Short mmCIF file of all heavy atoms in Angstrom, two decimals:
data_model
loop_
_atom_site.label_atom_id
_atom_site.label_comp_id
_atom_site.label_asym_id
_atom_site.label_seq_id
_atom_site.Cartn_x
_atom_site.Cartn_y
_atom_site.Cartn_z
N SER Q 1 -15.06 4.25 25.90
CA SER Q 1 -15.75 5.47 26.14
C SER Q 1 -16.95 5.61 25.24
O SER Q 1 -17.91 6.37 25.62
CB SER Q 1 -14.88 6.67 25.99
OG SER Q 1 -14.09 6.59 24.82
N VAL Q 2 -17.11 4.93 24.12
CA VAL Q 2 -18.14 5.08 23.15
C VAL Q 2 -18.89 3.92 22.85
O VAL Q 2 -19.89 3.94 22.06
CB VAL Q 2 -17.54 5.70 21.76
CG1 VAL Q 2 -16.80 7.00 22.09
CG2 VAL Q 2 -16.79 4.71 21.00
N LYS Q 3 -18.46 2.78 23.47
CA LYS Q 3 -19.14 1.45 23.17
C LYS Q 3 -20.62 1.58 23.53
O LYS Q 3 -20.88 2.18 24.54
CB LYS Q 3 -18.47 0.34 23.84
CG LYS Q 3 -18.58 -1.05 23.01
CD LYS Q 3 -17.94 -2.17 23.87
CE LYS Q 3 -18.24 -3.47 23.15
NZ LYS Q 3 -17.80 -4.63 23.96
N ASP Q 4 -21.44 0.91 22.69
CA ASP Q 4 -22.97 0.85 22.90
C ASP Q 4 -23.63 2.16 22.39
O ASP Q 4 -24.82 2.20 22.09
CB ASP Q 4 -23.35 0.59 24.32
CG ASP Q 4 -22.89 -0.75 24.84
OD1 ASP Q 4 -22.79 -1.73 23.97
OD2 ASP Q 4 -22.66 -0.98 26.00
N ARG Q 5 -22.87 3.26 22.45
CA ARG Q 5 -23.36 4.58 21.91
C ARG Q 5 -23.04 4.80 20.49
O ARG Q 5 -23.79 5.38 19.69
CB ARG Q 5 -22.94 5.69 22.80
CG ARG Q 5 -23.44 5.62 24.29
CD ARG Q 5 -23.04 6.87 25.00
NE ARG Q 5 -21.57 7.15 24.96
CZ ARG Q 5 -21.11 8.33 24.54
NH1 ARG Q 5 -21.84 9.24 24.12
NH2 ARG Q 5 -19.82 8.43 24.66
N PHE Q 6 -21.88 4.41 20.07
CA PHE Q 6 -21.31 4.64 18.61
C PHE Q 6 -21.42 3.43 17.85
O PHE Q 6 -21.24 2.35 18.39
CB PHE Q 6 -19.89 5.22 18.69
CG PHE Q 6 -19.76 6.64 19.24
CD1 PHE Q 6 -20.73 7.20 19.92
CD2 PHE Q 6 -18.62 7.36 18.93
CE1 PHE Q 6 -20.61 8.50 20.48
CE2 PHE Q 6 -18.46 8.66 19.46
CZ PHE Q 6 -19.46 9.25 20.21
N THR Q 7 -21.73 3.59 16.52
CA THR Q 7 -21.71 2.52 15.60
C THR Q 7 -21.07 2.94 14.25
O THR Q 7 -21.53 3.93 13.73
CB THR Q 7 -23.12 2.04 15.28
OG1 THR Q 7 -23.77 1.65 16.47
CG2 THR Q 7 -23.18 0.89 14.41
N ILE Q 8 -20.07 2.29 13.87
CA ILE Q 8 -19.33 2.54 12.59
C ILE Q 8 -19.90 1.67 11.55
O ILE Q 8 -20.22 0.41 11.91
CB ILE Q 8 -17.85 2.42 12.89
CG1 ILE Q 8 -17.07 3.03 11.53
CG2 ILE Q 8 -17.38 1.05 13.06
CD1 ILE Q 8 -15.61 3.22 11.76
N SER Q 9 -19.97 2.08 10.35
CA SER Q 9 -20.48 1.29 9.27
C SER Q 9 -19.95 1.99 7.97
O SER Q 9 -19.31 2.97 7.94
CB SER Q 9 -21.92 1.17 9.29
OG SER Q 9 -22.61 2.29 8.94
N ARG Q 10 -20.03 1.16 6.86
CA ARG Q 10 -19.57 1.72 5.63
C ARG Q 10 -20.58 1.28 4.40
O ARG Q 10 -21.21 0.22 4.59
CB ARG Q 10 -18.06 1.44 5.28
CG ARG Q 10 -17.76 -0.06 5.26
CD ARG Q 10 -16.34 -0.27 5.28
NE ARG Q 10 -15.62 0.46 4.23
CZ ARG Q 10 -14.32 0.85 4.33
NH1 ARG Q 10 -13.60 0.57 5.40
NH2 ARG Q 10 -13.85 1.57 3.36
N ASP Q 11 -20.48 1.93 3.38
CA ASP Q 11 -21.27 1.69 2.14
C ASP Q 11 -20.15 1.96 1.01
O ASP Q 11 -19.94 3.07 0.68
CB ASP Q 11 -22.47 2.59 2.06
CG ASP Q 11 -23.33 2.05 0.85
OD1 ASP Q 11 -22.79 1.62 -0.18
OD2 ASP Q 11 -24.58 2.35 0.96
N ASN Q 12 -19.64 0.79 0.49
CA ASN Q 12 -18.62 0.97 -0.47
C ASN Q 12 -19.14 1.41 -1.79
O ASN Q 12 -18.46 2.18 -2.52
CB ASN Q 12 -17.79 -0.29 -0.56
CG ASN Q 12 -16.97 -0.58 0.57
OD1 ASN Q 12 -16.61 0.23 1.38
ND2 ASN Q 12 -16.56 -1.89 0.81
N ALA Q 13 -20.38 1.05 -2.16
CA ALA Q 13 -20.91 1.47 -3.48
C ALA Q 13 -21.22 2.99 -3.42
O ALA Q 13 -21.10 3.57 -4.53
CB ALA Q 13 -22.25 0.64 -3.66
N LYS Q 14 -21.52 3.50 -2.31
CA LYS Q 14 -21.71 4.94 -2.08
C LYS Q 14 -20.43 5.66 -1.73
O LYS Q 14 -20.44 6.89 -1.58
CB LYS Q 14 -22.78 5.23 -1.10
CG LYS Q 14 -24.20 5.06 -1.53
CD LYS Q 14 -25.16 5.48 -0.49
CE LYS Q 14 -26.61 5.26 -0.94
NZ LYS Q 14 -27.58 5.72 0.08
N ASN Q 15 -19.33 4.98 -1.58
CA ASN Q 15 -18.01 5.50 -1.24
C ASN Q 15 -18.05 6.27 0.04
O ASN Q 15 -17.51 7.40 0.11
CB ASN Q 15 -17.58 6.40 -2.44
CG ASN Q 15 -16.01 6.60 -2.36
OD1 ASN Q 15 -15.27 5.67 -2.23
ND2 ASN Q 15 -15.67 7.87 -2.54
N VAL Q 16 -18.72 5.71 1.08
CA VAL Q 16 -18.84 6.46 2.29
C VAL Q 16 -18.66 5.56 3.54
O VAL Q 16 -18.93 4.37 3.53
CB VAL Q 16 -20.17 7.01 2.34
CG1 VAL Q 16 -21.28 5.99 2.20
CG2 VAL Q 16 -20.40 8.01 3.55
N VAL Q 17 -18.17 6.14 4.56
CA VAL Q 17 -18.09 5.46 5.90
C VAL Q 17 -18.90 6.41 6.98
O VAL Q 17 -18.74 7.70 6.92
CB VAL Q 17 -16.67 5.33 6.49
CG1 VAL Q 17 -16.57 4.74 7.83
CG2 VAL Q 17 -15.88 4.49 5.42
N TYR Q 18 -19.62 5.73 7.76
CA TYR Q 18 -20.54 6.42 8.61
C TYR Q 18 -20.13 6.25 10.06
O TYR Q 18 -19.61 5.15 10.44
CB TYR Q 18 -21.93 6.08 8.49
CG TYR Q 18 -22.56 6.27 7.14
CD1 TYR Q 18 -22.80 5.10 6.28
CD2 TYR Q 18 -23.01 7.48 6.61
CE1 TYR Q 18 -23.37 5.26 5.04
CE2 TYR Q 18 -23.55 7.63 5.35
CZ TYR Q 18 -23.75 6.40 4.62
OH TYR Q 18 -24.28 6.65 3.41
N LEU Q 19 -20.42 7.27 11.04
CA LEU Q 19 -20.37 7.02 12.43
C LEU Q 19 -21.55 7.53 13.03
O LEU Q 19 -21.82 8.78 13.17
CB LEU Q 19 -19.05 7.76 12.99
CG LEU Q 19 -18.87 7.60 14.46
CD1 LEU Q 19 -18.38 6.14 14.61
CD2 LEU Q 19 -17.74 8.51 15.04
N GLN Q 20 -22.40 6.57 13.47
CA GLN Q 20 -23.72 6.98 14.23
C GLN Q 20 -23.35 7.17 15.66
O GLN Q 20 -22.82 6.27 16.28
CB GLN Q 20 -24.75 5.77 13.99
CG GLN Q 20 -26.07 6.17 14.74
CD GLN Q 20 -26.70 7.43 14.13
OE1 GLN Q 20 -26.79 7.57 12.85
NE2 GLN Q 20 -27.34 8.23 15.05
N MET Q 21 -23.65 8.34 16.25
CA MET Q 21 -23.37 8.75 17.60
C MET Q 21 -24.58 8.97 18.27
O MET Q 21 -25.25 9.96 18.05
CB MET Q 21 -22.45 9.94 17.62
CG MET Q 21 -21.11 9.78 16.82
SD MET Q 21 -19.98 11.23 17.13
CE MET Q 21 -20.96 12.59 16.46
N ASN Q 22 -25.03 8.15 19.20
CA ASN Q 22 -26.30 8.27 19.94
C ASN Q 22 -25.90 8.68 21.33
O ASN Q 22 -24.78 8.43 21.81
CB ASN Q 22 -27.06 6.92 19.93
CG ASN Q 22 -27.52 6.55 18.55
OD1 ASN Q 22 -27.82 7.43 17.68
ND2 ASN Q 22 -27.67 5.29 18.33
N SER Q 23 -26.89 9.09 22.12
CA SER Q 23 -26.76 9.44 23.56
C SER Q 23 -25.56 10.27 23.72
O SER Q 23 -24.57 10.08 24.55
CB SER Q 23 -26.69 8.25 24.42
OG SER Q 23 -27.95 7.44 24.25
N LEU Q 24 -25.39 11.40 22.99
CA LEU Q 24 -24.17 12.25 23.04
C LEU Q 24 -24.01 12.89 24.30
O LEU Q 24 -25.08 13.24 25.05
CB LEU Q 24 -24.18 13.22 21.88
CG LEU Q 24 -23.82 12.49 20.49
CD1 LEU Q 24 -24.25 13.43 19.35
CD2 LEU Q 24 -22.39 12.23 20.48
N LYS Q 25 -22.78 13.18 24.72
CA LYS Q 25 -22.48 13.72 25.95
C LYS Q 25 -21.54 14.90 25.79
O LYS Q 25 -20.82 14.98 24.82
CB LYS Q 25 -21.71 12.74 26.78
CG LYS Q 25 -22.42 11.42 27.08
CD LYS Q 25 -21.80 10.57 28.18
CE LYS Q 25 -22.40 9.20 28.32
NZ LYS Q 25 -21.52 8.26 29.05
N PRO Q 26 -21.59 15.88 26.70
CA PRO Q 26 -20.59 17.07 26.58
C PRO Q 26 -19.22 16.61 26.36
O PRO Q 26 -18.43 17.29 25.69
CB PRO Q 26 -20.80 17.84 27.83
CG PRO Q 26 -22.18 17.48 28.31
CD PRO Q 26 -22.38 16.06 27.92
N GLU Q 27 -18.79 15.49 26.93
CA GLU Q 27 -17.42 14.89 26.86
C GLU Q 27 -17.14 14.49 25.47
O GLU Q 27 -15.90 14.20 25.12
CB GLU Q 27 -17.22 13.85 27.89
CG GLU Q 27 -17.40 14.23 29.37
CD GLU Q 27 -18.72 14.29 29.76
OE1 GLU Q 27 -19.73 13.79 29.11
OE2 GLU Q 27 -19.02 15.01 30.84
N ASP Q 28 -18.12 14.28 24.64
CA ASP Q 28 -17.86 13.82 23.20
C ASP Q 28 -17.64 15.03 22.34
O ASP Q 28 -17.38 14.86 21.15
CB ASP Q 28 -19.12 13.14 22.67
CG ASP Q 28 -19.44 11.85 23.39
OD1 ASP Q 28 -18.53 10.98 23.57
OD2 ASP Q 28 -20.55 11.62 23.86
N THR Q 29 -17.70 16.27 22.84
CA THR Q 29 -17.37 17.47 22.09
C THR Q 29 -15.89 17.37 21.64
O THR Q 29 -15.00 17.06 22.46
CB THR Q 29 -17.55 18.74 22.95
OG1 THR Q 29 -18.92 18.90 23.18
CG2 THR Q 29 -17.08 19.94 22.12
N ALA Q 30 -15.58 17.60 20.37
CA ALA Q 30 -14.22 17.41 19.81
C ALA Q 30 -14.31 17.70 18.24
O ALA Q 30 -15.39 17.68 17.68
CB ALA Q 30 -13.66 16.08 20.04
#
């Protein structure tokens, strides 16, 4: 449902994990 639109990544030195969500849709509300 999210492939090609979402990208997960992390930065361990900054102690963070990211979720880039592009082309968002009403169905992604949550």
Side-chain angles (χ1 to χ4, degrees):
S1 49
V2 307
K3 207 183 177 193
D4 296 331
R5 296 184 307 124
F6 290 16
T7 303
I8 189 166
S9 67
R10 58 192 307 153
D11 186 332
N12 289 340
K14 283 188 183 182
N15 200 47
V16 60
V17 177
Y18 304 106
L19 187 66
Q20 183 63 41
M21 304 189 295
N22 296 329
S23 300
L24 284 163
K25 300 196 191 162
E27 300 75 21
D28 297 308
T29 296

